[PDB]
Design a protein around this ligand. Sequence first.
Ligand SMILES: Nc1ncnc2c1c(C#Cc1ccccc1)cn2[C@@H]1O[C@H](CSCC[C@H](N)C(=O)O)[C@@H](O)[C@H]1O
Length: 279
Amino acid sequence: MDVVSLDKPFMYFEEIDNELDYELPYQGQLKLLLGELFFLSKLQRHGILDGATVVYIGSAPGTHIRYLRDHFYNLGVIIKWMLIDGRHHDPILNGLRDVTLVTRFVDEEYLRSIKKQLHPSKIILISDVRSEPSTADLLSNYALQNVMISILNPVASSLKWRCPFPDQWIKDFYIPHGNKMLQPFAPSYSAEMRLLSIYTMRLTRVTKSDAVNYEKKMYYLNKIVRNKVVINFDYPNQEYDYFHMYFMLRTVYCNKTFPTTKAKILFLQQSIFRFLNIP
Ligand SMILES: Nc1ncnc2c1c(C#Cc1ccccc1)cn2[C@@H]1O[C@H](CSCC[C@H](N)C(=O)O)[C@@H](O)[C@H]1O
């Protein structure tokens, strides 16, 4: 891995400043855990996580979600979880009174009834639904996620966002405004991000040129940026993904006090890796 010297990683897609012509155990749970710890801890900074209800659609198996609960439960934040998926959840989510497990594939009708029974409580939406996927599949998925936002009307949302490849384009489509969070420990050449929105919902047109820009910026990120060693980085592991994770984990609150920020992040990573059984 070529060495580099960085003050900060690329946190959002917009920050990628170059492009290139495209050519761990249970790492998926770690990717989701970090991204949702980042999202929900940003909402905790804005004082809008407390009292809300996280509706997580496409949450199964959702092993990492148990860490998410326990984290915010141990911080005293009052959160109710509603995990909705047609598949069965990881049994480690069992026996939690503040976590509701729902075995159902959501549609427009069922989103209406969810909203009725949670209204007027704050809803926070995390969607990870998926139906290799074609562009029609992605378009249907993203149409469903817009439907989720229009009906649930969440105070914030984190949406699975991967632009369809330019060589598989079908038509222009619309997604909500928001910041496109980059995911550490994503698969080596994944172009998936999490669309993070805080609602105060305007839709944005996505064009085939955007698809090209995504494909080229993410390839530069995956081929060049993520294969670097951050030599100035003071951490037991200086590979970019750990540098990336480190900056996400410092937005996380914690009840315990540490002599240094590095001490905190190290403890957090130790706690996350241990629970997910990562060496
Ligand atoms: N409507 C829905 N409601 C509930 N769950 C739905 C769906 C749907 C769909 C659809 C659809 C959309 C438009 C038109 C027609 C159909 C998919 N899923 C679930 O998304 C997960 C992806 S992988 C999660 C991984 C997980 N985050 C983990 O912790 O590992 C799977 O578990 C799958 O069962």
